[model samples]
Target: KSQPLPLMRQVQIAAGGLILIGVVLGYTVNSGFFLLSGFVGAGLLFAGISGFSGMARLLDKMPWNQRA
Candidate 1:
């Protein structure tokens, strides 16, 4: 059987992928889109230094997740 990913790992992957996609879209579509990637990067960096994950907390608050 396969194991599910931990919440931290999922959050990291989601944040990184979003940043990468945002960067590419910004480069190909509009410079303004880069700001989205910048915010993700800043959020990741802040969480890294502060040991608080806004994404993880947000995910935990989801109705589906809250049921568990």
Candidate 2:
């Protein structure tokens, strides 16, 4: 119940959140910067979601959890 998830999952989530922010910032802060950062940001978001979702599944399998 107390075991931690594979650390990659946490990193993925953080990276994804950062990418999302960067993409939004590109649109808000600068217009011509979408070609590269947008794609990289999207990739990060995808990877992050995949890793985080897996971690969430593992967490659900744990014995003790906070109820919603």
Candidate 3:
């Protein structure tokens, strides 16, 4: 059976994706989306300090990230 990528990789991918979208939307569509990039930055900081990430838990449940 095949397995999905490691949790850390998933987290990195999700965080990177969020920052990309945040930058795009914030620049072209609306300013509010800038908060997403800000949010990711703060979340990373918080996760680093707390050793726990709600985002990690959420990312794990995503359909594409599932493992068999």
Residues 1-57 of candidate 2 have per-residue lDDT tens digits of 566655665555556656656765565446534566455555555566666755765
Q: Clashes in model 1: which pairs?
A: none
Q: Give one digit per residue, the lDDT tens place, for model 1 in 12-62.
A: 656755665555445534554466634455445545533434455444433
Off by over 4 Å in 2: 32-68
Tens digit of lDDT per residue, candidate 3, span 1-68?
13453767566656756665555444534544456544555545444533434455445544553453
Model 3 has an lDDT value of 0.51
Q: How close is candidate 3 to the true structure, as a TM-score?
A: 0.32
In model 1, what is the error at residue 14, expressed in angstroms?
0.9
Question: How many backbone clashes are present in model 1?
Answer: 0
Of candidate 2, the 10-residue stretch with the lowest lDDT total is 59-68
All predictions: root-mean-square deviation over Cα?
A: 10.4, 6.0, 9.8
Q: What's the lDDT for all of these models?
A: 0.50, 0.57, 0.51
Candidates 1 and 3 compared by lDDT, better number: 3
Ranked candidates (TM-score, high to low)? 2, 3, 1
TM-score result, candidate 1: 0.31
